[PDB]
Design an enzyme around this catalytic site. Structure first.
Site, PDB file in Angstrom:
ATOM      1  N   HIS A 101       6.264   6.794   6.069  1.00 17.18           N
ATOM      2  CA  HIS A 101       5.772   6.843   4.630  1.00 17.18           C
ATOM      3  C   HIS A 101       5.045   7.766   3.903  1.00 17.18           C
ATOM      4  O   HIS A 101       4.932   8.864   4.837  1.00 17.18           O
ATOM      5  CB  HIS A 101       4.709   5.438   4.783  1.00 17.18           C
ATOM      6  CG  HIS A 101       3.447   5.685   5.527  1.00 17.18           C
ATOM      7  ND1 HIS A 101       3.542   5.859   6.788  1.00 17.18           N
ATOM      8  CD2 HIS A 101       2.408   6.319   4.986  1.00 17.18           C
ATOM      9  CE1 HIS A 101       2.259   6.155   7.153  1.00 17.18           C
ATOM     10  NE2 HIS A 101       1.633   6.640   6.094  1.00 17.18           N
ATOM     11  N   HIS A 156       1.930   9.130   1.165  1.00 19.09           N
ATOM     12  CA  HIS A 156       0.544   9.133   0.207  1.00 19.09           C
ATOM     13  C   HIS A 156       0.679   9.841  -1.059  1.00 19.09           C
ATOM     14  O   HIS A 156       1.392  10.813  -0.916  1.00 19.09           O
ATOM     15  CB  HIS A 156      -0.586   9.179   0.713  1.00 19.09           C
ATOM     16  CG  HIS A 156      -0.658   8.254   2.164  1.00 19.09           C
ATOM     17  ND1 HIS A 156      -1.237   7.310   2.224  1.00 19.09           N
ATOM     18  CD2 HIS A 156      -0.196   8.675   3.501  1.00 19.09           C
ATOM     19  CE1 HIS A 156      -1.356   6.628   3.504  1.00 19.09           C
ATOM     20  NE2 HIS A 156      -0.603   7.719   4.293  1.00 19.09           N
ATOM     21  N   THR A 169      -5.199   6.248   8.620  1.00 16.50           N
ATOM     22  CA  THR A 169      -6.055   6.407   7.434  1.00 16.50           C
ATOM     23  C   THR A 169      -6.006   5.158   6.466  1.00 16.50           C
ATOM     24  O   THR A 169      -6.480   5.297   5.139  1.00 16.50           O
ATOM     25  CB  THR A 169      -5.340   7.523   6.721  1.00 16.50           C
ATOM     26  OG1 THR A 169      -3.992   7.044   6.113  1.00 16.50           O
ATOM     27  CG2 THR A 169      -5.404   8.820   7.290  1.00 16.50           C
ATOM     28  N   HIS A 194       3.726  11.132   6.266  1.00 17.12           N
ATOM     29  CA  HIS A 194       3.641  10.707   7.865  1.00 17.12           C
ATOM     30  C   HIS A 194       4.713  10.000   8.693  1.00 17.12           C
ATOM     31  O   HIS A 194       4.989   9.131   8.161  1.00 17.12           O
ATOM     32  CB  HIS A 194       2.176   9.720   7.581  1.00 17.12           C
ATOM     33  CG  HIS A 194       1.000  10.291   7.034  1.00 17.12           C
ATOM     34  ND1 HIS A 194      -0.146   9.549   6.668  1.00 17.12           N
ATOM     35  CD2 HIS A 194       0.813  11.464   6.839  1.00 17.12           C
ATOM     36  CE1 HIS A 194      -0.801  10.357   6.271  1.00 17.12           C
ATOM     37  NE2 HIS A 194      -0.797  11.746   6.303  1.00 17.12           N
ATOM     38  N   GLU A 236      -3.704  13.196   1.762  1.00 19.50           N
ATOM     39  CA  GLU A 236      -4.843  12.672   2.326  1.00 19.50           C
ATOM     40  C   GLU A 236      -5.458  13.964   3.161  1.00 19.50           C
ATOM     41  O   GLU A 236      -6.735  14.178   2.922  1.00 19.50           O
ATOM     42  CB  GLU A 236      -4.156  11.869   3.339  1.00 19.50           C
ATOM     43  CG  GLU A 236      -3.676  10.460   2.714  1.00 19.50           C
ATOM     44  CD  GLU A 236      -3.991   9.049   3.431  1.00 19.50           C
ATOM     45  OE1 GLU A 236      -3.284   9.133   4.649  1.00 19.50           O
ATOM     46  OE2 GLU A 236      -4.399   8.267   2.903  1.00 19.50           O
ATOM     47  N   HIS A 275       0.794  -1.202   0.044  1.00 20.34           N
ATOM     48  CA  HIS A 275      -0.187  -0.053   0.005  1.00 20.34           C
ATOM     49  C   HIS A 275       1.022   1.316   0.100  1.00 20.34           C
ATOM     50  O   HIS A 275       0.428   2.483  -0.571  1.00 20.34           O
ATOM     51  CB  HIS A 275      -1.026  -0.009   1.042  1.00 20.34           C
ATOM     52  CG  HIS A 275      -0.685  -0.673   2.575  1.00 20.34           C
ATOM     53  ND1 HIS A 275      -0.839  -1.847   2.739  1.00 20.34           N
ATOM     54  CD2 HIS A 275      -0.329   0.143   3.440  1.00 20.34           C
ATOM     55  CE1 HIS A 275      -0.621  -1.899   4.050  1.00 20.34           C
ATOM     56  NE2 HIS A 275      -0.312  -0.821   4.578  1.00 20.34           N
TER      57      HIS A 275
HETATM   58  N1  LIG Z   1      -1.384   6.816   7.188  1.00 16.54           N
HETATM   59  S1  LIG Z   1      -1.338   6.544   8.749  1.00 16.54           S
HETATM   60  O1  LIG Z   1      -2.350   6.911   9.489  1.00 16.54           O
HETATM   61  O2  LIG Z   1      -0.030   7.500   9.195  1.00 16.54           O
HETATM   62  C1  LIG Z   1      -1.099   4.963   9.383  1.00 16.54           C
HETATM   63  C2  LIG Z   1      -1.884   3.964   9.066  1.00 16.54           C
HETATM   64  C3  LIG Z   1      -1.492   2.756   9.633  1.00 16.54           C
HETATM   65  C4  LIG Z   1      -0.340   2.431  10.504  1.00 16.54           C
HETATM   66  C5  LIG Z   1      -0.294   0.924  10.930  1.00 16.54           C
HETATM   67  O3  LIG Z   1       0.658   0.962  11.593  1.00 16.54           O
HETATM   68  N2  LIG Z   1      -0.929   0.125  10.388  1.00 16.54           N
HETATM   69  C6  LIG Z   1      -0.390  -1.104   9.589  1.00 16.54           C
HETATM   70  C7  LIG Z   1      -0.105  -2.122  11.061  1.00 16.54           C
HETATM   71  C8  LIG Z   1      -1.494  -2.571  11.512  1.00 16.54           C
HETATM   72  N3  LIG Z   1      -1.710  -1.602  12.670  1.00 16.54           N
HETATM   73  C9  LIG Z   1      -2.616  -1.884  13.824  1.00 16.54           C
HETATM   74  C10 LIG Z   1      -2.281  -3.322  14.373  1.00 16.54           C
HETATM   75  C11 LIG Z   1      -3.139  -4.281  14.403  1.00 16.54           C
HETATM   76  C12 LIG Z   1      -2.981  -5.683  14.980  1.00 16.54           C
HETATM   77  C13 LIG Z   1      -1.733  -5.899  15.467  1.00 16.54           C
HETATM   78  C14 LIG Z   1      -0.385  -5.046  15.375  1.00 16.54           C
HETATM   79  C15 LIG Z   1      -0.842  -3.472  14.785  1.00 16.54           C
HETATM   80  C16 LIG Z   1      -2.442  -0.203  12.054  1.00 16.54           C
HETATM   81  C17 LIG Z   1      -2.311  -0.106  10.766  1.00 16.54           C
HETATM   82  C18 LIG Z   1       0.329   3.416  10.651  1.00 16.54           C
HETATM   83  C19 LIG Z   1       0.052   4.647  10.265  1.00 16.54           C
HETATM   84 ZN   LIG Z   2      -0.314   7.675   6.005  1.00 11.10          ZN
END
Ligand SMILES: NS(=O)(=O)c1ccc(C(=O)N2CCCN(Cc3ccccc3)CC2)cc1
Ligand SMILES: [Zn+2]
Length: 257
Positions: free
Chosen positions: A91, A93, A195, A116, A103, A61
């Site tokens: 990362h 977008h 997001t 981000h 975003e 992604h």
């Molecule tokens: N675009 S952003 O808003 O900056 C952003 C979005 C997603 C993450 C993120 O870390 N993820 C990937 C990993 C999975 N985790 C949750 C998790 C659920 C179950 C066990 C572990 C982690 C959250 C989604 C970070 C920042």
């Molecule tokens: Zn992000």
């Protein structure tokens, strides 16, 4: 699986992630006239001099530049935050065209891309626990406009050839995320979410007012990445942004007049 296509993109996500229609979803439009100056907000403290980058990963992604977050090395403090938030990854977008990709929007203006810098609150001990808390994460968002090159981005741009497809990673040591910051740390802040799925409502958003400039060639290299795995049909990694979500019962605060 969720993604950014016609069949699995942001309008579909609520079917597996019902919090997609929740009360504190991100991103949002930042209406600069309705954001209120909060003179009680502190300057942001960005302490990245001891940052330890480890690796860069294409996760299907975006690409993440990961950091050693097992000690207080690269931390965000101050601003709207209580306590110490550790940098774990950054990362971006971005769009298929320079007129879209961010975003957050600013008076409905879309930027070419958005950085981000993802941090977690050390009182929760690890990132997996922090994402379960309403104050678990602090994400520093920085807009990217196309113009002059950002010299401090080029080390990232030059490795992307080695992580073209989903699940590819490469060593990425001694990268200094200070080279991605604008001059001003003036910001907007509001409570929001991740997001991407699982869209957890665990984020204090801090969105810098001043964009960074990157060249047309730098963002063109972002657009040669692939959402797909090696040996799968090629789908360019572009337009990996969620559109603005309803503000609902939230106030965006400004650190500046
Ligand atoms: N675009 S952003 O808003 O900056 C952003 C979005 C997603 C993450 C993120 O870390 N993820 C990937 C990993 C999975 N985790 C949750 C998790 C659920 C179950 C066990 C572990 C982690 C959250 C989604 C970070 C920042
Ligand atoms: Zn992000």
């Amino acid at each position: 699986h969720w993604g950014y296509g016609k069949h699995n993109g942001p309008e579909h996500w609520h079917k597996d992630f019902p919090i997609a229609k929740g009360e504190r979803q991100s991103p949002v439009d930042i209406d600069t006239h309705t954001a209120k100056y909060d003179p009680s907000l502190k300057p942001l403290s960005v302490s990245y001099d001891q940052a330890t980058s480890l690796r860069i990963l294409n996760n299907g992604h975006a690409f993440n530049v990961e950091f050693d977050d097992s000690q207080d090395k690269a931390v965000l403090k101050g601003g709207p935050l209580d306590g110490t938030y550790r940098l774990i990854q950054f990362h971006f977008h971005w769009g298929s065209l320079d007129g879209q990709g961010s975003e957050h929007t600013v008076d409905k203006k879309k930027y070419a891309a958005e950085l981000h810098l993802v941090h977690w609150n050390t009182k929760y001990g690890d990132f997996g626990k922090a994402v379960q808390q309403p104050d678990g994460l602090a994400v520093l968002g920085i807009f990217l406009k196309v113009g002059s090159a950002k010299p401090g981005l080029q080390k990232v741009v030059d490795v992307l050839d080695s992580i073209k497809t989903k699940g590819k990673s490469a060593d990425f040591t001694n990268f200094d995320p200070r080279g991605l910051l604008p001059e001003s740390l003036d910001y907007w802040t509001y409570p929001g979410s991740l997001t991407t799925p699982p869209l957890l409502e665990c984020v204090t958003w801090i969105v810098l007012k001043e964009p960074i400039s990157v060249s047309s060639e730098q963002v063109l290299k972002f657009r040669k990445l692939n959402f797909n795995g090696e040996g799968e049909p090629e789908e360019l990694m572009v337009d990996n942004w969620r559109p603005a979500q309803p503000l609902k019962n939230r106030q965006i605060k400004a650190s500046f007049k």
